[PDB]
């Protein structure tokens, strides 16, 4: 919509530090540092490659809007998401203890906090037993 | 109730779908029934056991188609257990699955026989036999290994095939006049073919001293050549299973999986579909168009997480070996160069 | 005497049990006797050598059962050579070994023949032949490799089997009318089966130009398919033997074995069953409920030694490879980070 | 027995430094340091896992009593013990020189002293020839 | 036009030359035509289908030779698409290619048949069949693996061959008098040969109890021995394909390729054939007989680049493994010795 | 002259001994002659070509024994080309070589025929055929791989063999009465044996519907089982050749070889047999019972060089891999601990 | 020619620092350092081995003239050159973007400048589309 | 002989630093250091194992005399010596350039000097062509 495009344009200028119609990796570094995170040149470059389709090295507003307008159902992440959960589903049943899901999710790599993972358990562990029916959740979200 | 009703539908769905060990045995028993029906038809072919035939085969066939439609309706009604199919339209598109499509078609034709025919009957039993593997992963596996070995396979067949022709030609000259067996060149074609294939019907064979002489030579060649592709594909399977077990030893993708899902749920929280969710919303506001900032930041980050996960999904045994191999060596290089730089910074003090 | 009496009992026990090279040859000779008895029975089947038969087979069979019970009593009386069986009750539970159980049962039945019968006789000789492998490790080894190769094996048989059916069907149509050989579909079933199996009785075979035409094609397919599983299992064995030799190259568990036994004897000394033992008691009192302190400390430590040993019992070739591989790289990482930290601590000076 | 349980309770409080009904890894570190040994967090944690059956991370008195009441015959360590001795039985006969058994036992990893290994030779090398009949010893002990 | 004319000539040249997937299929269809012509000749051998024969085979053969010369002229005229052949003389030397030479010779002989003959005809069809593989890489591949396995192959054949002779000898003694089958020693030669080859004509076979007795033993030996070389060559192919895929995994020669080409173009610029080119000339004059200095410097450097590239062209999997393996270890050694030297230089301060 | 005379003797000695490519071809031609003589004897067996036989075989045989003794005398007289044999006594002990011994014995017996006989003649030709491989390395290689695969080999034969017996038993019951083929149990023994061996004479085979039914099952089992050992030994050879080529890739023993020879020549110089040699004597006197000091020092050092060389003679692919693997990791450990120690020594400053 | 040989002799003395009729590795090191490059002993030794045919370790004038008088067509570098371009021809067609050819050529190992690689594109990318018809170029040069 | 045994006894006391009837590794270290060489504990221990047959860790005079009384022909080093020369005989003919034999022998590991290797060429390269007929030499010596 025009509202979404104009609002993405305002956020783009926020991210578009140099204002060249694209987002450069150095914009990305300084913006993430402003948010507190220290993104490496490889990370910001990977972000560009994710967003950049023309392959210019700087994220123009078209690529940003294309990325933003997509949804989890608009991601084709169903097989991917259930693959991940099955990797973290050691027994293969379709459930893993939400405790362990917190223990790895909130405690692996770009880990999250206890509150975010708790809401993850609420939205994921559909019956709320700790054993998240991860394929049901990935279906409800990725679809 | 209704909730547990749906959960049973979905569970039973993957029950009918890939089962781990238990329902696999169940479908096995299914195969037992169908295969037995085949064999009974086999005995049906002979008239000397006809009267002792129709009852079992007839009624059992009926039972078979019964359980056929049974599992079919379970499949179809449990089609909403996935995400796409639901209500009536999506699951309809599920019916658009050509497997399901032709399955139902043959299903009703089997119904049609309820009222040359037996010949089609046999063919039907074949087709239902093909039904055994749903996903047909067998065929994919084979074609995989074959195309992997295309060149050497073809060179094997081609070469030995030439050996066939030359052998047959010389033998034809050697015994065509002397032996009735070998009268036309096509004769020796047939003979040499079954010869090098180690079949050995024996209905024809050389009797000229000259023929047998040259033969034994060509035997020692041809038989080996034709047995080649068997052993080739065999060892190919054994290897590929070993390496598949090896990558089963090495996945390592838990890290990209976690970060993938993390950025994912970051999007889902940032996803304005649910603003009542605030744990990640509060996280983004506390970790600092501020809404689109948090959202778009997660979109870009989570997108790179998508690619980093997918790329990380396939780290291979010697692949990881050499990458960290070069890595560790080059790392050591950067480490030692930093060591030289650090000490030499101290040298100027 | 009595002590040396018992030690001989135990030694001879594992003599009857797994021998290294020497008694292995002895049991081999045992097998020689039994197998020969089999073959003699084989000639016993014919009446043209009957009179030249009964003496040897009869008396030799007697001798056989003699040595049977001989080794049996040696087994049973040497059952206390282990720990469990002793006196009369424990060794009785040893008799509860189903191998020993049915062995003795068939033993007495063999006695029963001392006073249709010959048919059971042959069957008996079979069963005693099964006796050859006591532990039956053969079967475990095979089933191991098979289940290891379950998928590809089944896909092999299934696929080529389908090739069988289709081949037979087309040939049936091609030559059923023309050739008496192929009159019922079951006929071509039998024929095509033995065809693709490279047996080639030759009693039936195509004579229609059309049949032979299509056949040769299907030959080139089917024969390869059926030979698949042979070569597959073969190479599987060769590999697995190589890797077994490799782990024979790599055990490394001496360290956990030592610490295991060390904590073990620590417990045994701390074990109040023997307080006159003081070397480890003096050790614990000098290495500082003090009794339960030394004991329980050893129990906890020795228990972790149990698990550390058992876990360490199975370090594998590429397993150890990648673990120390990642280890050495990550180690170097910690080492270099410590190097940077150390130099940079010097930087502020 | 009540005597064993009460005595294990007294020793447990000795080990139960914090007195939470369970033994925490830090209790284990400080207790072992008191005895002179420096147990790492992984070692004390492994000790908990050995003793801890409920999986709390701290050794309660139930797990301690279950571990303590077990004997070598109550360990099922026969195959394990003879496996170890066979690893240290290079020739496979069932004997190894008690000298070498000292050389590795008292000189491998968590090694022991000469006196402890000498008593090991006395109780193990049944005929006292230096060649310990290790399966006879493991049978007499592990049974 | 003329430029695009030439570019089409060159492109179509490698079209006729190694195509990737598309023209490969085209030449496949070519093979389809030729092979079919073969089979039709096969049916031509019989008089019972003669009248239904000549038209198709005759006209189709004509068509075949048509497309033969077609592709031939495309080959020859597209011979200048390389560097050597050009104008009329160089491409003439291209005609000196013995493949092209004998191809054209047989080509005109095929023309000669336009006006015993059929026997030569069949032979012709064979030869054209040999034409299938132009480069004949098949033969090179096979001979490669064979000579790789020369020793064990020969020991296999030789040993089992001896088994053949001994078997035949003993059987000859056993059944020569009793059975007509086996009358001369050459008889049993033929029989035992086809026996151990798993062919089993069955026209002759033992009937002496004594013969069959000894046979089965020798069977269990000989059959295995003769099947050896099949499985050997098979697994050999499977391995070598795996390792070839592995080196396909590891090339690494991009660095020497770049430096090679760099020094190359350095020469080309320094190459006085083109002095109007100045980018590398200006580079050499700005990076400082000055002309021969820049040229000869590039010649020496580019020559070392030639050897460094060529040597780098073949880095192998375990080759690179152990070289960097020793390298990294020895590197670490130099690194740590430098670390000791650096700290100890600081020690004297 | 005499010196060049001796050098020719020694060179020609290893000429008759292992040649590289050239004389290998020469002995090949030798084999050609002997083998041809065999085949001619083969035709000698038949009376229909007798008159066209004796001349060639007779004279050629004579020629053969001629070249036999020729190479023999070359062998014997070139026996001093080694170190042990010399003059008349040492080379006499060379004649004590049982290969040489029985060679000469059969040699003179071949002379004996110069003046039932033909049967021994054939046997002679066999034996001379065995002469082909002098060192017999073939047999060692085979037995190597076999004993390497003893267990799985035996389990293969044993298991399938049992399958044989059970199959034959059931078939015997099924068709003994109905079919004359199968009358005695030994009959079905013979039949099932050749059945599962894929030979398929076809003289006997089931005709009972019940028999054929059970058969096909047992076929699918037995045929695979018996083909096992072929493929097993085949892939075994292919592997072992690969690994042998791998160790051909990795020797590394040049360092211990050099130090070995160095300490060796140190001994030789210190060896008082030659005191006129002074380079190493001057070396020892200048590198400082002084004579026995230099000598005994070299003896102890050179002896450790002997063991270090011999031990270093067999560094294996994964052996060296893991040794330097653990080594490099533990090395890095010592290196980093030294790094910590060095920096922390600086910390107290 | 006599002109080429005498001119190569003058340049040889320029390279022949010690004047022993051959070029020693140390001459090579100092000469390359004079041009700015720092050639290692292994590099200069490899240069000798490339030029040195007699195997003396020092490049005499004969070896230098033999190397110099050779041309790219006198190199047999056709298969080699097209092998390299095919390695840097990922798709195998016979073309690669001249941009990427600059990116690797001018930016790999002993890399060149933008101007040299631009002239490379001009002489190589025959149609001047960026996709250098590398086999046509290697034929025109290596022949 | 009595002369050899008494002279070996005098040299043994020279090596037998501690005079315990055996030569200890520390005697070996100090003696080799006196000669200039620095033998590690592993090297001296290997020397003992070479000489020590009873396995005491110190070289008694019996082991020393047994080692000393042996000759190259008393070494069974023929296959070993020719194996070494064949490793250093790249072409397998039975000859290697005495230059290269100097280059590796005098320049590998415990390398020797030019004079010792020159005498090696004289005694080894029987025809004195540089190509040492190494099997003839190993036969003349090892026998
Ligand atoms: O299962 C059936 N057909 C089929 C065939 C192939 C595959 Cl792959 N799957 C399914 C079937 C069910 C009911 C019926 F009456 C007739 C046939
Ligand atoms: O050995 C005997 N049966 C047996 C069978 C299978 C296995 Cl695995 N072990 C033992 C046996 C001994 C004496 C006798 F009279 C009859 C039979
Ligand atoms: O292709 C032909 N011969 C040939 C044979 C072998 C190879 Cl390897 N290549 C080519 C051919 C073309 C025209 C014609 F009339 C007759 C024969
Ligand atoms: O070569 C001969 N026998 C032989 C056999 C086996 C081996 Cl392995 N080596 C040699 C031989 C030479 C002259 C002669 F008159 C008869 C026989």
């Amino acid at each position: 919509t025009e509202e979404q495009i104009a609002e993405f344009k305002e956020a783009f200028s926020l991210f578009d530090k140099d204002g060249d119609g694209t987002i450069t990796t150095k914009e990305l570094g300084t913006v993430m540092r402003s948010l507190g995170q220290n993104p490496t040149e490889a990370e910001l470059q990977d972000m560009i490659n994710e967003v950049d389709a023309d392959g210019n090295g700087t994220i123009d507003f078209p690529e940003f809007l294309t990325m933003m307008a997509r949804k989890m159902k608009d991601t084709d992440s169903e097989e991917e998401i259930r693959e991940a959960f099955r990797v973290f589903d050691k027994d293969g049943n379709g459930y893993i203890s939400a405790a362990e899901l917190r223990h790895v999710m909130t405690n692996l790599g770009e880990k999250l906090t206890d509150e975010e993972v708790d809401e993850m358990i609420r939205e994921a562990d559909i019956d709320g037993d700790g054993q998240v029916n991860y394929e049901e959740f990935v279906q409800m979200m990725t679809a | 109730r209704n909730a547990f009703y749906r959960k049973l539908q979905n569970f039973l769905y993957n029950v009918l779908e890939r089962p781990r060990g238990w329902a696999f045995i169940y479908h096995a028993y299914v195969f037992l029934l169908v295969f037995s029906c085949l064999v009974l038809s086999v005995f049906s072919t002979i008239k000397e056991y006809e009267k002792s035939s129709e009852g079992a085969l007839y009624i059992l066939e009926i039972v078979t188609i019964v359980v056929f439609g049974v599992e079919y309706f379970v499949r179809i009604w449990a089609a909403g257990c996935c995400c796409r199919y639901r209500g009536w339209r999506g699951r309809l598109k599920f019916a658009r699955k050509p497997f399901c499509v032709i399955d139902i078609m043959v299903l009703i034709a089997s119904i049609a026989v309820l009222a040359s025919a037996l010949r089609s009957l046999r063919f039907l039993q074949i087709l239902r036999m093909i039904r055994m593997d749903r996903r047909g992963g067998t065929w994919k596996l084979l074609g995989s290994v074959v195309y992997a070995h295309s060149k050497e396979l073809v060179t094997a067949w081609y070469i030995g095939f030439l050996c066939l022709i030359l052998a047959s030609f010389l033998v034809y000259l050697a015994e065509k006049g002397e032996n009735d067996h070998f009268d036309t060149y096509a004769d020796a074609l047939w003979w040499g073919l079954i010869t090098l294939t180690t079949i050995g019907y024996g209905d024809k064979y050389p009797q000229t001293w000259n023929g047998r002489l040259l033969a034994a030579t060509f035997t020692l060649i041809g038989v080996s050549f034709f047995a080649l592709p068997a052993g080739i594909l065999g060892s190919g399977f054994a290897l590929k299973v070993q390496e598949q077990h090896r990558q089963k030893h090495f996945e390592k993708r838990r890290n990209p999986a976690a970060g993938l899902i993390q950025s994912a749920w970051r999007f889902y929280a940032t996803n304005l579909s649910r603003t009542d969710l605030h744990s990640t919303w509060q996280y983004y506001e506390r970790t600092v168009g501020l809404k689109v900032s948090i959202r778009a930041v997660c979109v870009m980050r989570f997108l790179v997480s998508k690619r980093k996960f997918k790329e990380s999904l396939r780290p291979y045994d010697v692949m990881d070996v050499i990458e960290q191999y070069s890595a560790g060596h080059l790392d050591m290089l950067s480490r030692i160069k930093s060591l030289q730089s650090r000490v030499d910074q101290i040298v100027g003090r």
Side-chain angles (χ1 to χ4, degrees), chain A, chain B:
Chain A
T1 187
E2 64 286 347
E3 190 275 331
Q4 174 198 36
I5 197 72
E7 213 269 329
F8 284 171
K9 174 46 60 180
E10 169 192 359
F12 177 89
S13 312
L14 161 63
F15 293 103
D16 189 5
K17 193 176 178 182
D18 308 321
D20 65 312
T22 49
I23 319 294
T24 66
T25 185
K26 305 297 91 178
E27 316 180 350
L28 325 171
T30 178
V31 290
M32 199 75 201
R33 299 159 193 178
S34 297
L35 165 65
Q37 199 82 222
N38 58 90
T40 59
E41 56 89 340
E43 183 271 355
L44 317 160
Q45 192 64 3
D46 294 325
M47 295 182 74
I48 302 144
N49 307 0
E50 316 288 325
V51 194
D52 183 0
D54 170 72
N56 69 322
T58 52
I59 299 301
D60 53 29
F61 187 44
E63 301 150 358
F64 167 74
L65 60 83
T66 42
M67 185 198 62
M68 297 303 305
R70 310 159 187 165
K71 278 196 176 185
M72 48 191 188
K73 49 181 178 56
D74 191 60
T75 301
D76 298 331
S77 47
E78 200 49 271
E79 81 294 346
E80 202 162 352
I81 191 175
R82 186 176 292 173
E83 284 172 350
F85 283 97
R86 290 173 170 173
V87 189
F88 293 116
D89 188 22
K90 280 61 65 179
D91 60 42
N93 66 8
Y95 287 80
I96 308 94
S97 44
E100 161 50 16
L101 308 197
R102 301 178 284 168
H103 168 277
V104 56
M105 186 85 153
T106 43
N107 320 111
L108 191 156
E110 175 43 21
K111 330 166 168 201
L112 284 198
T113 76
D114 48 321
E115 313 79 357
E116 280 178 329
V117 76
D118 294 330
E119 287 309 331
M120 292 181 242
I121 303 177
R122 314 179 175 193
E123 192 53 10
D125 183 17
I126 303 299
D127 45 354
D129 70 347
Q131 286 297 318
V132 168
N133 48 10
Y134 63 72
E135 67 179 0
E136 175 44 21
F137 189 36
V138 305
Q139 286 203 353
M140 177 269 290
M141 280 195 36
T142 313
Chain B
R1 296 303 85 162
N2 178 24
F4 184 90
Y5 175 71
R6 271 81 181 262
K7 73 88 183 179
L8 203 56
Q9 173 174 12
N10 306 321
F11 166 81
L12 280 298
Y13 150 74
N14 279 121
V15 182
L16 181 159
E17 295 301 328
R18 193 278 185 287
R20 300 192 291 257
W22 189 280
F24 192 75
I25 296 290
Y26 176 84
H27 294 293
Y29 278 72
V30 188
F31 169 77
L32 302 173
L33 279 300
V34 54
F35 167 92
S36 64
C37 180
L38 171 154
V39 312
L40 273 295
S41 57
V42 181
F43 281 96
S44 318
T45 196
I46 67 169
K47 293 204 170 182
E48 311 185 5
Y49 290 70
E50 292 290 334
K51 153 68 174 190
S52 65
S53 72
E54 174 186 338
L57 58 88
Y58 186 87
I59 189 163
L60 278 50
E61 186 171 25
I62 303 165
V63 174
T64 60
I65 300 168
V66 190
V67 58
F68 273 116
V70 188
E71 288 199 319
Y72 163 78
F73 284 170
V74 193
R75 182 176 292 256
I76 58 172
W77 175 75
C81 315
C82 79
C83 44
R84 291 79 56 213
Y85 323 130
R86 287 178 293 171
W88 41 266
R89 153 75 171 195
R91 330 189 183 200
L92 177 62
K93 179 174 180 176
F94 156 69
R96 178 176 177 179
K97 298 295 289 184
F99 168 92
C100 297
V101 171
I102 190 162
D103 169 71
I104 320 166
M105 153 183 184
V106 61
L107 160 55
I108 312 317
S110 58
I111 305 300
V113 175
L114 166 51
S116 70
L118 181 39
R119 323 171 171 184
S120 44
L121 180 154
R122 298 175 164 177
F123 190 78
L124 155 57
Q125 311 314 105
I126 307 144
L127 303 175
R128 58 183 66 248
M129 283 271 170
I130 295 93
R131 161 204 179 87
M132 288 323 88
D133 185 351
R134 188 273 157 268
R135 287 320 306 180
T138 80
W139 294 79
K140 268 298 180 178
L141 175 59
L142 185 154
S144 79
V145 183
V146 167
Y147 171 62
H149 297 275
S150 298
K151 200 79 76 167
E152 63 285 27
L153 270 293
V154 75
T155 179
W157 274 344
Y158 157 87
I159 177 57
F161 148 83
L162 172 149
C163 295
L164 177 68
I165 305 199
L166 164 52
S168 198
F169 203 93
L170 301 175
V171 286
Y172 187 60
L173 184 153
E175 204 176 24
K176 146 169 196 167
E178 301 326 323
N179 174 334
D180 59 356
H181 286 162
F182 304 161
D183 291 336
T184 84
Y185 196 55
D187 319 328
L189 166 147
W190 158 268
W191 168 86
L193 168 59
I194 205 167
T195 304
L196 318 186
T197 57
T198 81
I199 293 194
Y201 281 163
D203 64 12
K204 281 170 306 323
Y205 52 94
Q207 298 186 359
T208 287
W209 61 268
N210 226 352
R212 311 198 171 182
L213 179 152
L214 55 86
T217 64
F218 280 40
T219 78
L220 271 289
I221 314 316
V223 57
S224 41
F225 279 31
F226 280 103
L228 293 205
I232 276 178
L233 299 181
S235 89
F237 285 166
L239 299 207
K240 183 193 188 76
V241 73
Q242 181 181 8
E243 279 68 332
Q244 211 63 357
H245 171 71
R246 313 318 314 117
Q247 185 172 359
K248 182 207 105 177
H249 194 72
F250 293 148
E251 153 186 66
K252 307 170 288 296
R253 70 159 76 174
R254 274 77 55 184
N255 312 316
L260 184 90
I261 313 164
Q262 297 164 328
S263 47
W265 165 265
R266 291 187 165 195
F267 165 92
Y268 188 65
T270 60
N271 213 9
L272 303 180
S273 62
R274 304 163 180 265
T275 302
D276 64 353
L277 298 177
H278 290 299
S279 69
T280 307
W281 279 90
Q282 293 177 335
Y283 172 93
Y284 274 102
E285 64 175 9
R286 300 161 172 189
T287 46
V288 296
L290 197 53
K291 288 197 83 89
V292 66
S293 178
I294 276 155
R295 273 189 301 295
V297 171
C298 167
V299 188
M300 322 167 304
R301 301 193 303 223
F302 168 54
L303 176 51
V304 317
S305 88
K306 313 165 40 180
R307 289 300 86 194
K308 61 149 189 48
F309 175 76
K310 267 316 188 201
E311 309 147 345
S312 64
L313 299 196
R314 279 74 176 180
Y316 299 170
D317 59 357
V318 63
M319 301 210 328
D320 75 8
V321 165
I322 182 51
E323 33 184 320
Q324 164 184 349
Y325 184 38
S326 45
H329 203 174
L330 58 85
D331 291 327
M332 200 199 329
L333 278 159
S334 44
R335 304 154 194 222
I336 303 301
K337 62 86 182 171
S338 54
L339 176 156
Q340 306 143 335
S341 43
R342 301 163 172 301
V343 63
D344 301 352
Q345 188 269 329
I346 308 289
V347 182
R349 297 176 163 181

